[PDB]
Amino acid sequence: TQARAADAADDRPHRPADWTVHHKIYYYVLVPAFSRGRCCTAGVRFDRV
Amino acid sequence: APQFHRPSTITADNVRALGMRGLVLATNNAQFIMDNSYPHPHGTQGAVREFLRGQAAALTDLGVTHANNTFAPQPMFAGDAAAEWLRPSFGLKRTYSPFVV
Amino acid sequence: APQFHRPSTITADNVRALGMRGLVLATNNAQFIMDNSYPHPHGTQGAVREFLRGQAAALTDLGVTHANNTFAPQPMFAGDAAAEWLRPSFGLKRTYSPFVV
């Protein structure tokens, strides 16, 4: 999921360290405020998509 | 010709040789009762493996036919250029309208 | 040719053979006085039953005269696709402009 299609790695993190922290602030904090408890996280059928 | 109510007949090349316009209709004109007596050897879910190798291949056959319709798609991101040492690498946010008049 | 002041005259074939444009003027040029000499064999409500089996059968008969003006009726709801093990079933909200030029 990195930008460089040429540069892939096994274990090296290409995103910054704050990239992961900003995610949990979004989904766990802003999302319950705007959903007010009506939202879900669904598994994906990529074959049918 | 591929038949969508038989599993062991659906391959990629039987789909790729058909155009993407008629590929919509052939899955829309199959039989609602499926024949299961001749299954695909890699599982029935393995029949889904080959067909999404098949539509993705026929995207390119649609892509060649509109190469006279769009321009050349440049690299999107930096770090990919030939002479990076006297001038740097850009990358085009593919946001314009590629259209050949 | 049905006479709408006599309830024992209206059949489905007397209404369907008459055109939808001519059905407007045939009923509007009828008689105010309702004759009670020959009632309908299924009662007076039995003629109200038979009166609508001829009109609504001309909905598709006017659809034939308008079939060269719109497109084929797509599925509008779920569970309607041929190869449902590889791709699902859609349904068109007919919010577009069905019109054939």
CB contact under 8 Å between B31 and C87, yes or no, is no
Listed residue (C13, C14, C12) closest to C2, CA to CA: C14
Sign of CA dihedral C60, C66, C67, C70: negative
> Chains with 3 or more CB pairs closer than 8 angstroms to A?
B, C
Contact B3, B34 (CB under 8 A): no
Q: Quick one: how far is CA B66 from the chain centroid?
A: 14
Residue linked to tokens 């995103």: A15
Resolution of the experimental structure, in angstroms: 4.1
Structure solved via: cryo-EM
* Residue pairs between chains B and C whose CB atoms are closer than 8 Å: 24
| Sole residue written with tokens 């900003």 | A22
* Dihedral of the alpha carbons of B11, B13, B19, B23, in degrees to the nearest 10: 0
Q: Which of C85, C89, C92 to substitute to test the interface with B, most B CBs within 10 Å?
A: C85
Alpha carbon distance B49, B27 (integer Å): 16
